[PDB]
Design a protein around this nucleic acid. Structure first.
Ligand code: ZN
Lengths: 176, 59, 207, 38, 145
RNA sequence: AUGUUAAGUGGAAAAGGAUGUGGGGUUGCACAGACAACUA
RNA sequence: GCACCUCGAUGUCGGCUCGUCGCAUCCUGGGGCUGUAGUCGGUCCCAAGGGUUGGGCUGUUCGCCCAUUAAAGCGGCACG
RNA sequence: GAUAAACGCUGAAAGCAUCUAAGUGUGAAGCCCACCUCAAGAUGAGAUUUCCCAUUUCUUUAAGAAAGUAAGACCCCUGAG
C-alpha cells in the first residue's frame, strides 16, 4: 500500500485513547470514535503516526489502505471538519432555515421538510445556496445526497438541486 | 459385536480399527464375540487387552 | 377500549334532523358486570371478564356461584373477555352501561349467523346452474371434481353441507342514538344473528 | 442499461468493474455505454 | 442361539448432560448429539431397546453457520392445500426461534420409527445460558469433534 | 503430509465475454529518477 | 421419425359446470436508456398479489366483424 | 419490518478512479406482520378462576379388588332462535 504506508501527523489538541480495538480521536470540536482491526497497530511519538502490516495476507494490501484512510479522515475532521455546498437553478425555487428544519420550495404542490441530526447543521444564506457542516465525512455526504435527492437536475434546462460543481450534460430539446 | 467393541475401546483411548491392528501385531486371536462379551462383563480384562494393543503399535 | 354485551331485539326506522329515513337495529343491554381481571404476573396477558343477563338460581350450580361470589352479583348467562383496554381504570364489581358510547362512534358488531341446515353448492357457495332444457340432465350440481393426473381430489373443492351458524363481524357502523333509562342502543344498518341472540359491540379497529 | 452476455468497452473512457459476481462497464462520457453482464 | 447380552427396558442407567453450542457448526454438534441420544457410546447398546442419555443444548442463539448459509439455506413446508408451499425461513430461525433450528437438524439424523421418535423427546434446547433442569444434576460434555 | 476452490462449484448444458485467483516463461520503461496525480 | 405400452375393450372435438399450476407479463406496481421539450410513446430489467367483456356469422376450433374495456396474455393438467 | 431491479455515502486493493472487499443507507400491487375466520388428538395433549374431600374382606399391602356416595352429569318428558 502507498496509502497504507503514508504518515498521519496530528495537529494541536489531539488526544488518542487506546482500548483494545477502539480509537477515539478528540480535538477542539468533537470526540469521534471508530472500530478498527487487529492486524494493523498503533504508534508512539506524538505528532506522528505510521501504520504497519504483517504481510502474507492474500490481497496483501486492502485492509491496510482503508484502516489508514479512516483515521486520517477522523483527524482531518475532528480538527477541521468538512463542507458540502449545494446550488439551486430552476426559477422559483428557494430554501429557508429555522433551527434544524430545512424548508424547500421546488415545483411541488407541497413544501418539503428535512431535519439535521446532532453533529450536523445547515447554512442557508440565500434562496439558492445550502451548506452542510459537520465532523463526520460520511454523514455530511449522505445528508447532502439526501437533499439533492429531492430533485435531481434535468438536462434540458438544468433545473433542480445540484452539488456546487456537478457537470451536467445539456440536450437540444426541439421547439415542439 | 463390532459396535459394542468400538464403544468400549473409545473409553480406553483407542478406536476400533487401531485396536484391531494392535491386537494383530501382538498375535492375539480373540473373536469379536468374546471381545464384546468381555467389553460388557469384565472391563478389567478388556483393559488388559487394550494395553497390550497400545504397547504393540507403540513401536 | 369501549365494549359492551347485549341482546338483539329487532329492526325499525327513524327520521333524522334533516329529515332522512334511516334503517336501524335495536340492541338491549342491561348493565354488564366485571367478574375478573387478568394480568401478566398471574395469567400472562391482560384482559377483563364481563358477565351479562341475570339467571334464575335453580339453573346454575355450585362452581358458578363461587365464581360469581367475589363480585356480589347473581349468576350470569353470557361471559366474555374484552381485550386491549388499559386495565387500571377497572375493578371487580364495576358496572359497564350503554352510556359508554355516544352518538357518532363508529363501532364493530359481532354475532352468530342464523342456521339453515344442509344446503347445496348453489345456495351455499353461489355456484351457477346447468341448462334447464336442450336435452340437459345437469341442473343443480357441484361441478367436475378435478383433473385426471393426480389420481385424487384436491382440498377446498367445495360441496354441499351444513350452512350458517358461524361468527361474523361487520365493521364501521354508526351509533344513531343512546337511551339510558331503557338500556338501548340504536345502530344504523343490519347485524348478524336471530332474535334474542348475543351481540357484542366494540369501538372500531380501523379508526 | 444494456444486459447482454457480451460486455465490452466501447469507447476510451469506459472502465470494467465487478460489483458482485457480475461484470459491468461504466462510462462517464456517454450513459448509453453502461452495461451489465447477464 | 447362544450367549450375547441383550439389555432390558429399565435396566441401564440414563445420565443427564449439558452441551454448549457457541461457535460449533450446526451439523457437527448435531451429529454428536444424535449419537449420544441413541446410546452408541455405551457397550450395552442393543438396537431394539432405548439406552441413550438425555441432552440439554444451551446457547442455541450462537450456533455457527459457514459460507452464506445464513441467507441462502432455506426450509420448506407444505400445508397440503393447492399452491401452499411456505419457503418462509432461512437463518432467520437463528434470530427468532432458535430451538426449531437445532431440533430440525437433530431430527433428521435419528431413525424414522417409533423408537427414534421417542428418543427425540430427550433433547431440551435453550437459546440462552440457563436451563430449568438443575434437579437432575447434569454433567458437562466437552466437544472437540 | 503438501497444496487449490468461495462457486453449495462439488451435486445437469454451448458459441462467446471478463482487472476472479494459483504456477511457469518472454520482455519494454525504471535512483544520469520511473506509471498515476496534480501547475503552467 | 420410431413401434416399448394398452386388441379377454385406455370413449373423439367445441360448448357447459368446477378449476388449478408455469412465466417467455395483456392491465395495474417499481426502474435504467432514448433519435425522452410537455401530452403520448419505443425498448430493455425486476415483479405471478389480484384482474382479464357481451353479441353477429359458421358443428366448428381458428377466423372475420359490431359495440365496449384499465386490459380483452400465452402455455401445461390423458391437446384438464 | 426485511428485500428485487435500480440508485448511493464513505472507502482501499491499484498515490488516482471506483456502490464493496471492511463499514453505511434508500427502494415494488411482491415476502413477513397488519384485517377476518378455524385451532391444545400442538400424544410437546399448555394456562387461569371456582366446586367436592375416606366402608369390607385379603391375593399381600401393592398405582390390589369390590361396594355405597360428594361436586356434577345423564336416561325420560314440553319444545325451537
Ligand atoms: Zn464510452
Amino acid at each position: 500500500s502507498r496509502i497504507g504506508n503514508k504518515v498521519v501527523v496530528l495537529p494541536a489538541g489531539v488526544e488518542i485513547k487506546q482500548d483494545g480495538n477502539n480509537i477515539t480521536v478528540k480535538g477542539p470540536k468533537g470526540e469521534l470514535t471508530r472500530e478498527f482491526s487487529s492486524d494493523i497497530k498503533m504508534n508512539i511519538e506524538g505528532n506522528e503516526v505510521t501504520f504497519t502490516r504483517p504481510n502474507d495476507s492474500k490481497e496483501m494490501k486492502t485492509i491496510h489502505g482503508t484502516t489508514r484512510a479512516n483515521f486520517n479522515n477522523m483527524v482531518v475532521g475532528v480538527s477541521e471538519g468538512f463542507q458540502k455546498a449545494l446550488e439551486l437553478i430552476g426559477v422559483g425555487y428557494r430554501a429557508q432555515v429555522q433551527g434544524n428544519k430545512l424548508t424547500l420550495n421546488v415545483g411541488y404542490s407541497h413544501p418539503v421538510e428535512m431535519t439535521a441530526p446532532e453533529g450536523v447543521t445547515f447554512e442557508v444564506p440565500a434562496n439558492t445556496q445550502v451548506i452542510v457542516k459537520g465532523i463526520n465525512k460520511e454523514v455530511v455526504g449522505e445528508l447532502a445526497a439526501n437533499i439533492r435527492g429531492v430533485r435531481p437536475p434535468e438536462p434540458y434546462k438544468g433545473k433542480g438541486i445540484r452539488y456546487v460543481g456537478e457537470f451536467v450534460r445539456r440536450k437540444e430539446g426541439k421547439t415542439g | 459385536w463390532i459396535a459394542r467393541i468400538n464403544a468400549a475401546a473409545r473409553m480406553n483411548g483407542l478406536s476400533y480399527s487401531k485396536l484391531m491392528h494392535g491386537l494383530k501385531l501382538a498375535e492375539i486371536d480373540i473373536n469379536r464375540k468374546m471381545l464384546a462379551d468381555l467389553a460388557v462383563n469384565d472391563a478389567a480384562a478388556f483393559t488388559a487387552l487394550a494395553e497390550q494393543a497400545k504397547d504393540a503399535l507403540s513401536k | 377500549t369501549k365494549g359492551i354485551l347485549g341482546k338483539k331485539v329487532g329492526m325499525t326506522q327513524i327520521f333524522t334532523e334533516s329529515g332522512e329515513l334511516i334503517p336501524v337495529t335495536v340492541v338491549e343491554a342491561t348493565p354488564n358486570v366485571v367478574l375478573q381481571v387478568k394480568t401478566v404476573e398471574t395469567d400472562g396477558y391482560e384482559a377483563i371478564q364481563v358477565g351479562y343477563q341475570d339467571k334464575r338460581e335453580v339453573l346454575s350450580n355450585k362452581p358458578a356461584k363461587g365464581h360469581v361470589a367475589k363480585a356480589n352479583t347473581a349468576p350470569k348467562r353470557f361471559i366474555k373477555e374484552f381485550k386491549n383496554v388499559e386495565l387500571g381504570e377497572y375493578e371487580v364489581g364495576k358496572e359497564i352501561k350503554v352510556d359508554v358510547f355516544q352518538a357518532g362512534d363508529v363501532v364493530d358488531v359481532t354475532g352468530t349467523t342464523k342456521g339453515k341446515g344442509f344446503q347445496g353448492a348453489i345456495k351455499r357457495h353461489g355456484q351457477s346452474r346447468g341448462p334447464m332444457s336442450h336435452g340437459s340432465r345437469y341442473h343443480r350440481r357441484p361441478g367436475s371434481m378435478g383433473p385426471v393426473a393426480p389420481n385424487r381430489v384436491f382440498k377446498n373443492k367445495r360441496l354441499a353441507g351444513r350452512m350458517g351458524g358461524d361468527r361474523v363481524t361487520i365493521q364501521n357502523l354508526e351509533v344513531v342514538k343512546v337511551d339510558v333509562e331503557r338500556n338501548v342502543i340504536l345502530i344504523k344498518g343490519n347485524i348478524p344473528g336471530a332474535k334474542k341472540s348475543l351481540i357484542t359491540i366494540k369501538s372500531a379497529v380501523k379508526a | 442499461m444494456k444486459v447482454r452476455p457480451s460486455v465490452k468497452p466501447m469507447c476510451e473512457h469506459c472502465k470494467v468493474i465487478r460489483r458482485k459476481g457480475r461484470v459491468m462497464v461504466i462510462c462517464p462520457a456517454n450513459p448509453k455505454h453502461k452495461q451489465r453482464q447477464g | 442361539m447362544r450367549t450375547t447380552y441383550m439389555a432390558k427396558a429399565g435396566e441401564v442407567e440414563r445420565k443427564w448432560y449439558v452441551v454448549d453450542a457457541t461457535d460449533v457448526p450446526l451439523g457437527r454438534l448435531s451429529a454428536v448429539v444424535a449419537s449420544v441420544l441413541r446410546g452408541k457410546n455405551k457397550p450395552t447398546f442393543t438396537p431394539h431397546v432405548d439406552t441413550g442419555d438425555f441432552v440439554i443444548v444451551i446457547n442455541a442463539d450462537k450456533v455457527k453457520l459457514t459460507g452464506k448459509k445464513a441467507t441462502d439455506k432455506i426450509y420448506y413446508r407444505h400445508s397440503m392445500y393447492p399452491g401452499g408451499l411456505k419457503s418462509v425461513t432461512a437463518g432467520e430461525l437463528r434470530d427468532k426461534n432458535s430451538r426449531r433450528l437445532i431440533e430440525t437438524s437433530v431430527k433428521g439424523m435419528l431413525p424414522k420409527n417409533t423408537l427414534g421418535r421417542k428418543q427425540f423427546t430427550k433433547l431440551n434446547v435453550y437459546g440462552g445460558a440457563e436451563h430449568p433442569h438443575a434437579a437432575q444434576q447434569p454433567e458437562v460434555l466437552d466437544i472437540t469433534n
